[PDB]
């Protein structure tokens, strides 16, 4: 059972269910939350620190750059993936896992990318939120060694490799669906939900595209066949010669009616 830093951030106390709890030093020494640091000194010390072999870290890097999830994840994510791959290698025979990840299939839809599907607090038609379900609502919820990964990039590459991923709850994950940012200029995807500029081309051109992966290593990723998202309407305006508050004012195009006695900065 490999514990990721997201499990430490969410105070996931799963030391009872798993016995092979191993992780790397820099994923636990980079946490900036003081409550996690206080909780780390109370929990029993069954955790062990080790460094993966260079060969396996390298091969993790080649299929990480094959799967297209290369820039989204960091070096600590590489170390976590290498450690869980090594733990799977020296516990179980290595013939179970596979390489050359499957090509992604195309399946468009007419729904808008900002449709609030599978958000718990809303109701599409029933759909009700009780206090008993607050502990239940963490993510999409459905043997010897597992992973306590939280971010979708590591779960995506693990389910692409066929490695069984675990959660804060007892059971494993069968389906994993989320949103990523795809560029429509240079056709490069990024799973970082907070970024606004692209990686390769560098424009402010990323748009929301949904993804869903399974246990078998099959991935399907949905566009939106709505012309509202892809149009250059509010994108050209003359520029003057050279934080999160006031966010909806920027989303208006400048070439539009504002009130006569108000001013944009």
Q: How many residues bind RNA (CB under 7 A)?
A: 20
Q: How many residues bind another protein (CB under 8 A)?
A: 47
Instruction: Select from 100, 183, 191, 179 the least CA-distant residue to 154.
Output: 191
Question: What is the DSSP secondary structure assignment for residue 131, as one 8-state letter?
Answer: G
Contacts to Zn ion from residues 186-225, by CB under 5 A: 186, 198, 200-201
Residue 198 assigned as binding residue: yes
Angle between helices 152-161 and 75-91 (to 10 degrees): 30
**What are the structure tokens assigned to 45, written together?**
């010390």
Residue 45 or 237: the one with the smaller Cβ distance to RNA is: 237
Residue 149 or 190: the one with the smaller Cβ distance to Zn ion is: 190
Q: Which of 233, 243, 246, 250 binds RNA (CB under 7 A)?
A: 233
Distance between CA atoms of 143 and 127, rounded to whole angstroms? 33
Residue 183 assigned as binding residue: yes
Element (H, E) at 207: strand 206-214
How far apart, in Å, do the first and last CA atoms of the chain sit? 53
**Minimum distance from residue 143 beta carbon to another protein (Å):** 30
Q: Which of 158, 163, 180, 183 binds Zn ion (CB under 5 A)?
A: 183
Instruction: Select from 55, 219, 204 the least CA-distant residue to 153.
Output: 219
Neighbouring-strand partners of residue 72: none
**Minimum distance from residue 216 beta carbon to another protein (Å):** 28
Residue 162 or 234: the one with the smaller Cβ distance to RNA is: 234
Interface map 196-225 toward another protein (x if CB under 8 A):
-xx-xxxxxx--------------------
Contacts to another protein from residues 45-84, by CB under 8 A: 54, 57-58, 61-62, 71, 74-75, 78-79
Residue 147 assigned as binding residue: no
Residue 230 sits in the site that holds Zn ion (CB under 5 A): no
Dihedral, 98, 101, 107, 113 alpha carbons, nearest 10: 100
Instruction: Select from 73, 71, 72, 91 the least CA-distant residue to 81.
Output: 73
Structural Rg of the chain based on CA atoms: 22
Distance between CA atoms of 126 and 164, rounded to whole angstroms? 32
Q: Where the chain is broken, by preceding residue (C–N > 2.5 Å)?
A: 125, 142, 242
Residues engaged in binding another protein (CB under 8 A): 54, 57-58, 61-62, 71, 74-75, 78-79, 116, 121-125, 127-132, 134, 184-186, 197-198, 200-205, 230-232, 235-237, 239, 241-242, 248, 259-261
Residues engaged in binding RNA (CB under 7 A): 227, 231-241, 253-260
In the annotated binding site, the residues are 183, 186, 198, 201
In the annotated binding site for Zn(2+), the residues are 183, 186, 198, 201
Residues engaged in binding Zn ion (CB under 5 A): 183, 185-186, 198, 200-201
């Amino acid at each position: 059972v490999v514990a990721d830093a997201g499990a430490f951030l969410r105070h996931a106390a799963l030391q009872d269910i798993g016995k092979n709890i191993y992780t790397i030093r820099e994923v636990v020494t980079e946490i900036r939350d003081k409550a996690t640091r206080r909780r780390l000194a109370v929990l029993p010390y069954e955790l062990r620190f080790k460094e993966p072999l260079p060969e396996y870290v390298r091969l993790v890097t080649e299929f990480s750059k094959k799967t297209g999830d290369y820039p989204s994840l960091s070096a600590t994510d590489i170390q976590v993936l290498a450690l869980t791959y090594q733990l799977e290698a020296e516990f179980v025979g290595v013939s179970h896992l596979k390489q050359e990840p499957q090509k992604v299939k195309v399946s468009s839809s007419i729904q808008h990318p900002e449709t609030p599907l599978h958000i718990s607090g809303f109701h599409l038609p029933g759909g009700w939120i009780t206090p008993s379900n607050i502990k239940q609502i963490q993510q999409e919820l459905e043997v010897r060694v597992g992973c306590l990964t939280t971010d979708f990039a590591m779960q995506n590459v693990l389910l692409q490799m066929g490695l069984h991923v675990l959660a804060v709850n007892g059971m494993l994950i069968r389906e994993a669906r989320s949103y990523i940012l795809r560029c429509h200029g240079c056709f490069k995807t990024t799973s970082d939900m907070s970024r606004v500029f692209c990686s390769h081309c560098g424009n402010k051109t990323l748009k929301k595209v949904s993804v869903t992966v399974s246990d078998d290593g099959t991935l399907h990723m949905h566009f939106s066949r709505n012309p509202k998202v892809l149009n250059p309407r509010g994108l050209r305006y003359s520029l003057p010669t050279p934080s999160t508050l006031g966010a909806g004012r920027r989303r208006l195009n400048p070439n539009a009616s504002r009130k006569k006695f108000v001013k944009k900065r």
